[PDB]
Symmetry: C3
Subunit: 32 residues, 3 copies
């Protein structure tokens, strides 16, 4: 379970960062 967990956190890290970047751009495009 520890390796399952670490693999999944590694994946979540990436998706969260991606979402941060997309939100940053959207904020710019809307002026927020």
């Amino acid at each position: 379970r520890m390796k399952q967990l670490e693999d999944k956190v590694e994946e979540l890290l990436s998706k969260v960062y991606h979402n941060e970047n997309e939100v940053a751009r959207l904020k710019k495009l809307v002026g927020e």
Copy 2:
């Protein structure tokens, strides 16, 4: 702590996916 961790990753998975979906729609609505 292992069960706490897994429960929390399970919850984070869901929220991240939800955020991905909402961002996808917003990108469409703004044209991004």
Copy 3:
């Protein structure tokens, strides 16, 4: 590895919530 994992989930919790809040506002600003 357990402490590394918990520290990282704690950080991901925060970033996910932040992203939720930003998405909520954007949805309002676009009308989504």
